[PDB]
Design a protein around this ligand. Structure first.
Ligand code: MU3
Ligand code: MU3
Lengths: 304, 304
């Protein structure tokens, strides 16, 4: 037993990280097959970032201007193109360590692991969630751009995020592996404020089920509620509305614990209205929302 | 910016995980060079666990009784020995993926990454701290024994923990890689209760410095304190006493932020006495103690 904020094993993704340098700018690239993917802002000077015309800035770059280093060896760039906000650098060597992979665009509320990298080298791995305002709360310093977010289904890595930037509020923004930003963010040094960071209700409920499975049961009460009544309280507390689709997704956890989804909603409603009173749930003093129902089942069943 | 509970990249350790089976029992082993290390309780039936005589149970086991599988290939066991609570299985093939490594015994308060495994296969990675009562609060189900804890210094993995058991309270116990348990725990299905789980003061202070570096400054106050005054409050709150050695260790973080260590102690003293008042620090509603001062510097500087 025990329940931790767990990231996927990062080995398969470490095998893909390379360093990409264009002029004075060094960031990370993701090498899969014979393509290296990286944020297109690698072509910018800090001055260009204020109002960059990427097509125009790219005209001044040739294949030999993109320096790609995998470990201590240089890769030969034989082609380059821009797809949305990412560059795809075609190299002459397929990555021998390329795992089975997919490029997926995730929905808000979905979690993933980030392998934070600097100069093509992994520094650490942590678990993130795509927030309902399409930001992530990561740990990214200068040089971390191009680090990726992913999930793993046994031996297939599904890449869902590439890090591009930090907003003035300290929250993070990035793209899927097709270069499309999550949310309304743009790769420009301009005023960009994030919307409301609501709490991912279905994930909190999943985590309350993990707490029950792992023996923390003090918050269970004698009440029930309805989706409509629960959502009135969820609205007041800046929680995402709970839908019948979320109820269906929590079905397996409801079955495992014998606690009906709406009874768990009533427990959550009381926790919102009354607070924790100085108590903790799975070592947390706040309601955790960065575990999906699938993450809870995965961790509680020991999937590899 | 941003500060996350980050684990080390796990690739180097994934390359070492194997499955070990003895009779009906399957757990994990750590394959380094031509030796596979695993918990000695792999030789026990659930019945033997109540009062096992490991030397006697081991007499009934031969090299061919230890089935070691690395991926989908079987390893040949050419020797076996017991060192404290671990078995060392000599195999005929050195692990080709053996990283540079050390075996270290850590002190309470030190953190490490755990690569949770089942049947020699990695399921996830998370960050732990050796608690002051020599337990860890992990996420370990049946089959996870033999999963290891480690730290990495660039390319050298220092293995510090091997998982052996779960106490009736749901907390975890294990050994260093020489097979010596942390704390007073024994590998026997008997009443073993953990002592007081005090809070690792030096780690909380390090995390308050990370909060200041990452822009969360509301808790900074106009006060200072002394080590003796602070420790009177630390004692009342079940916090570890702060020593001049801890003050020295926090020196670099004090320098980076310009906040004297004793002023940060005074901020912590007020947080203990007054609570958070519904506010958060780095997204937490409790004072986090599973980041060492070295972890804070490492993460805030982007070490790879
Ligand atoms: O935010 C950036 N880098 C970054 N992403 N996460 C952390 N970091 C560094 C800690 C800042 C850079 C800085 C200059 O302005 C822009 C504009 C657009 C895209 C990227 C950037
Ligand atoms: O605790 C154990 N296994 C375990 N370690 N973490 C999680 N788990 C399983 C979730 C229980 C086993 C169970 C039988 O009794 C003993 C006695 C000594 C050593 C190991 C064990």
């Amino acid at each position: 037993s025990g329940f931790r904020k767990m990231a996927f094993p990062s080995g398969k993704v470490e095998g893909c990280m390379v360093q990409v340098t264009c002029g004075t700018t060094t960031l990370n690239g993701l090498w899969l097959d014979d393509v290296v993917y990286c944020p297109r802002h690698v072509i910018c000077t800090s001055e260009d970032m204020l109002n960059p015309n990427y097509e125009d800035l790219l005209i001044r770059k040739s294949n030999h201007n993109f320096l790609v280093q995998a470990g201590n060896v240089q890769l030969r760039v034989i082609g380059h193109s821009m797809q949305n906000c990412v560059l795809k650098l075609k190299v002459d060597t397929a990555n021998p360590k390329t795992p089975k992979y997919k490029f997926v665009r995730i929905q808000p509320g979905q979690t993933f692991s980030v392998l934070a990298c600097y100069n093509g080298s992994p520094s650490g791995v942590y678990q993130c969630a795509m927030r309902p305002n399409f930001t992530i709360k990561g740990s990214f310093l200068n040089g971390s751009c191009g680090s990726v977010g992913f999930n793993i289904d046994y031996d297939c890595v599904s890449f869902c995020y590439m890090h591009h930037m930090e907003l003035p509020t300290g929250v993070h923004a990035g793209t899927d592996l097709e270069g499309n930003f999550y949310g309304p963010f743009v790769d420009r040094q301009t005023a960009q404020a994030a919307g409301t960071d609501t709490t991912i209700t279905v994930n909190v409920l999943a985590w309350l089920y993990a707490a029950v499975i792992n023996g923390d049961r003090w918050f269970l009460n004698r009440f029930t509620t309805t989706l409509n009544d629960f959502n009135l309280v969820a609205m007041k507390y800046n929680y995402e509305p709970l839908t019948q689709d979320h109820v269906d997704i929590l079905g397996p956890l409801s079955a495992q614990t014998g606690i009906a989804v709406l009874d768990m909603c009533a427990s959550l409603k009381e926790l919102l209205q009354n607070g924790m009173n100085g108590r903790t749930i799975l070592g947390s003093a706040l309601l955790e929302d960065e575990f999906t129902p699938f993450d809870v089942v995965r961790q509680c069943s020991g999937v590899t």
